[PDB]
Amino acid sequence: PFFPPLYLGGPEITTENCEREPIHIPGSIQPHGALLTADGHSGEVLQMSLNAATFLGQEPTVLRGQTLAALLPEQWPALQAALPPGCPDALQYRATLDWPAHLSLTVHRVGELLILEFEPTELRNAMFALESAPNLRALAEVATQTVRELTGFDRVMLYKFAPDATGEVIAEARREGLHAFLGHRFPASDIPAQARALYTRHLLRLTADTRAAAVPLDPVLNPQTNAPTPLGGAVLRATSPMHMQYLRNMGVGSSLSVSVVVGGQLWGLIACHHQTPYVLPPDLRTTLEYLGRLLSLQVQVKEAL
Amino acid sequence: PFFPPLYLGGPEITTENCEREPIHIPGSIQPHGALLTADGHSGEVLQMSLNAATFLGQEPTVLRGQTLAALLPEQWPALQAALPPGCPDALQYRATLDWPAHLSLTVHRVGELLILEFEPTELRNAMFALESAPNLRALAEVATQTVRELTGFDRVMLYKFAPDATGEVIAEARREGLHAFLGHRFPASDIPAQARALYTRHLLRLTADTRAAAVPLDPVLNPQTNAPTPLGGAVLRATSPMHMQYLRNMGVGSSLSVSVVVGGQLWGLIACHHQTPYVLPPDLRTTLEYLGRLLSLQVQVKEAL
Ligand SMILES: *C/C=C1/C(=C/c2[nH]c(/C=C3[NH+]=C(/C=C4\NC(=O)C(C=C)=C4C)C(C)=C\3CCC(=O)O)c(CCC(=O)O)c2C)NC(=O)[C@H]1C
Numbered sequence: 001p002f003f004p005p006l007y008l009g010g011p012e013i014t015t016e017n018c019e020r021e022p023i024h025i026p027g028s029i030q031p032h033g034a035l036l037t038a039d040g041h042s043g044e045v046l047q048m049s050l051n052a053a054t055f056l057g058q059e060p061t062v063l064r065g066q067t068l069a070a071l072l073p074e075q076w077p078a079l080q081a082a083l084p085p086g087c088p089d090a091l092q093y094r095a096t097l098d099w100p101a102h103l104s105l106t107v108h109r110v111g112e113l114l115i116l117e118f119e120p121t122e123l124r125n126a127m128f129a130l131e132s133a134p135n136l137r138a139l140a141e142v143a144t145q146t147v148r149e150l151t152g153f154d155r156v157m158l159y160k161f162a163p164d165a166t167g168e169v170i171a172e173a174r175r176e177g178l179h180a181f182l183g184h185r186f187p188a189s190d191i192p193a194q195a196r197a198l199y200t201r202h203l204l205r206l207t208a209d210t211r212a213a214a215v216p217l218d219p220v221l222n223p224q225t226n227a228p229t230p231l232g233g234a235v236l237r238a239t240s241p242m243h244m245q246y247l248r249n250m251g252v253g254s255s256l257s258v259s260v261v262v263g264g265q266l267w268g269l270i271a272c273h274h275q276t277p278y279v280l281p282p283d284l285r286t287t288l289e290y291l292g293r294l295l296s297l298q299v300q301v302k303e304a305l
Numbered sequence: 306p307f308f309p310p311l312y313l314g315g316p317e318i319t320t321e322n323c324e325r326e327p328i329h330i331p332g333s334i335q336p337h338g339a340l341l342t343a344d345g346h347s348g349e350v351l352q353m354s355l356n357a358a359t360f361l362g363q364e365p366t367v368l369r370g371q372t373l374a375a376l377l378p379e380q381w382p383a384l385q386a387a388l389p390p391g392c393p394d395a396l397q398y399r400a401t402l403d404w405p406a407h408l409s410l411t412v413h414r415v416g417e418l419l420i421l422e423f424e425p426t427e428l429r430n431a432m433f434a435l436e437s438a439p440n441l442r443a444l445a446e447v448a449t450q451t452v453r454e455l456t457g458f459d460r461v462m463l464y465k466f467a468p469d470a471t472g473e474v475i476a477e478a479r480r481e482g483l484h485a486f487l488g489h490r491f492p493a494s495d496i497p498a499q500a501r502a503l504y505t506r507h508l509l510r511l512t513a514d515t516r517a518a519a520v521p522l523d524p525v526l527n528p529q530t531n532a533p534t535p536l537g538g539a540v541l542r543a544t545s546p547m548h549m550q551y552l553r554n555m556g557v558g559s560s561l562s563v564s565v566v567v568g569g570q571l572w573g574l575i576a577c578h579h580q581t582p583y584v585l586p587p588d589l590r591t592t593l594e595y596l597g598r599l600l601s602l603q604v605q606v607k608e609a610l
């Protein structure tokens with residue numbers, strides 16, 4: 001079972017108990033966007049990331065308690081219609097807003113809570129390139145090479161899980177001068193069981209800046225439940241300190257991965273590194289999610305042979 | 306061999322390589338005091354902790370380059386006479402200064418560098434209590450109980466090293482309500498080899514506040530040598546992040562230990578915890594150093610029987 005999070009008196013995570021980090025409920029976000037939680041009926045803003053004024057203009061203490069009818073009058077009705085009570089937490093409302101001096105808005109529902117993620121915002125041959133691959137290796141290589149072209153990431157790897165959950169880099173497209181990870185294998189504990197579980201459900205995650213401090217949600221608990229706000233489906237979710245350190249020690253300033261899910265099992269990751277911090281456009285991330293789905297279908301086929 | 310420190314491009318320490326942390330050259334101090342390094346001939350202030358204005362009044366950018374003749378006109382000549390070239394780094398000049406609105410000054414020499422530590426400042430039956438102990442256990446118990454009375458620490462332990470460097474709490478005096486560590490043994494890696502080595506030479510260290518950020522030395526390298534400033538003999542030395550986390554996970558806000566050195570070997574530690582941050586007076590620390598020396602003589606005698 002998970003430790004309590006830091007804000008509920010849980011210990012700081014060490015290598016003895018990686019697997020017990022409640023990574024899904026960090027009570028904080030990455031500072032390149034803002035996060036609001038709102039009641040799914042009233043649209044009352046229940047929680048905000050402490051940086052919410054940097055993106056949304058209003059004071060933090062004045063945003064709390066206001067409704068999405070006031071804040072987002074054109075989106076609020078579409079938001080309600082798109083994310084009614086009972087819908088799954090993978091379903092997402094996405095809107096582009098014009099704001100003082102563009103913001104991408106991503107909304108999903110967990111129970112009675114709407115989770116709103118604000119971040120700044122501002123192809124076809126890829127699918128047939130994956131399809132044309134004669135064997136798994138070729139597919140692996142075209143997948144990593146295509147993802148690198150679309151994203152500009154310094155390194156894109158296809159990271160394959162073995163049955164014992166150890167991983168291997170089976171293909172990679174890298175910037176000139178970077179050393180190869182191709183064929184290197186890594187312990188199961190590098191992506192621990194709860195991460196692997198989370199990654200089977202929520203297919204994309206990232207750390208835009210491996211040195212950025214996480215921005216608290218205030219209030220930290222959902223006042224609907226007096227319990228942690230589930231952030232597994234929020235891309236703005238704060239990354240595990242343990243993983244961030246791992247990335248820093250590798251010289252990785254930005255990281256992003258996409259789950260490759262085959263037969264309902266975590267088959268692998270498209271894993272991306274940038275040496276510098278790097279915010280991939282939200283539209284671009286949507287392409288990667290889709291590319292990961294398409295790759296997952298292709299991998300099932302070609303690995304059967 | 307040690308990793309380079311963080312400021313010279315070394316990695317962040319993980320449990321794989323605890324023993325490679327260059328804990329003696331953190332390039333930083335604990336924020337409850339200030340540290341200056343000065344040339345041992347000219348008294349030119351070569352490095353300062355970035356907080357030096359909080360304690361010493363002058364601007365940081367104006368302190369750099371000034372001499373101890375200007376700053377400390379009454380101490381500078383005594384300092385030079387007390388710490389001439391070639392003297393050992395355990396030798397310490399200690400002075401009490403009156404300052405705007407008292408500061409304890411501790412100086413030691415390493416090579417051609419004077420290291421100046423500033424912190425705010427403001428018994429006899431103990432020795433005969435140690436002497437009167439009929440066996441090692443009794444001595445252990447009176448030692449921890451005496452240290453607790455003198456310091457007010459919430460927990461004082463006698464931590465004994467076994468031949469395999471695993472440790473055991475063989476005696477402790479604790480605040481009511483604290484759970485016992487008596488008889489508990491711990492892995493060798495909790496106090497890794499370089500710490501054990503450092504602790505054989507420099508007999509006292511502390512973390513006044515296990516949540517305090519370390520204050521950088523500026524410039525970080527000694528300009529005499531373009532190499533790290535040795536801080537093994539500075540009590541203001543920043544504590545290993547790994548140890549600070551360990552203490553935080555135990556609910557320890559302040560920690561202090563004194564080496565018990567028997568036959569030139571690290572026999573054990575008088576290890577002290579406070580739940581809240583806690584700065585022990587510099588005079589009081591001097592008593593503990595002496596108590597640790599006296600305890601070390603007593604332990605040699607009584608363990609022979
Ligand atoms: C005791 C804690 C450990 C630990 C925790 C941890 N790791 C992750 C997430 C990832 N780890 C990854 C590992 C690699 N990336 C690489 O590039 C390579 C080798 C070339 C490896 C082995 C990857 C890909 C992820 C996924 C996230 C990402 O794509 O960056 C988590 C979960 C993070 C989160 O979602 O918040 C956790 C908790 N990792 C360790 O190494 C030990 C110390």
Ligand SMILES: *C/C=C1/C(=C/c2[nH]c(/C=C3[NH+]=C(/C=C4\NC(=O)C(C=C)=C4C)C(C)=C\3CCC(=O)O)c(CCC(=O)O)c2C)NC(=O)[C@H]1C
Pocket residue numbers: 319320321322323324326328464472474486491494495496497500510511512543544545547548551560561562563574576577
């Ligand atoms: C991978 C790194 C590890 C590690 C590093 C580490 N630990 C120390 C210093 C100390 N550790 C101590 C251990 C204990 N204190 C206790 O109270 C108990 C149990 C009741 C234990 C086992 C102690 C006493 C010290 C000495 C300092 C002090 O008195 O607080 C260092 C050196 C710190 C420094 O001087 O900068 C280091 C590098 N410790 C681990 O547990 C692993 C994670």
